[PDB]
Ligand binder design. Structure first.
Ligand SMILES: COc1cc([C@@H](C(=O)N2CCCC[C@H]2C(=O)NC2(C(N)=O)CCCC2)C2CCCCC2)cc(OC)c1OC
Length: 127
């Protein structure tokens, strides 16, 4: 699947290089600029537990997902991953539990020790 493809071909984008967050660019974005800490970022995304038990999609809500980058408003994997995206880029991200919800998980959607997969499209950002 897409999860297995990211394991094989994904770039490790973690500081520690522990393969906790792996990225493949699926669509190349525009220009060179990437978002700064505190930038308001607008995305569409699809997400699922790697094994497949749960699925989530901003498209199904007809609403872009917005957050402030690098503030812990989202799982670490997103703060790391979205920082690397250009406007219009689409990437796939595989996220180990240590960059997501770890041992605790989150009731009721995320079990303990869950690896998460995401497709993310960066629509826009602004400081
Ligand atoms: C743990 O709570 C949620 C998590 C998500 C998804 C999720 O993991 N996130 C939503 C998209 C941004 C990344 C990540 C996230 O940071 N979630 C939040 C968090 N942990 O602070 C920030 C927004 C919702 C909770 C998962 C849903 C199950 C399939 C895998 C992705 C969606 C959710 O609602 C649609 C959640 O409920 C608020």
């Amino acid at each position: 699947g897409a999860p297995a493809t990211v394991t094989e071909q994904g770039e490790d984008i973690t500081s520690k290089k522990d393969r906790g967050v792996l990225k493949i660019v699926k669509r190349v974005g525009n220009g060179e600029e990437t978002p700064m800490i505190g930038d308001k970022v607008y995305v569409h995304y699809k997400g699922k537990l790697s094994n497949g038990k749960k699925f989530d999609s901003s498209h199904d809500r007809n609403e872009p997902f917005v957050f402030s980058l690098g503030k812990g408003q989202v799982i670490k994997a997103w703060d790391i991953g979205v920082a690397t995206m250009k406007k219009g880029e689409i990437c796939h991200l595989l996220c180990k539990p240590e960059y997501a919800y770890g041992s605790a998980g989150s009731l009721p959607k995320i079990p303990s020790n869950a690896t998460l997969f995401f497709e993310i499209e960066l629509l826009d950002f602004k400081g």
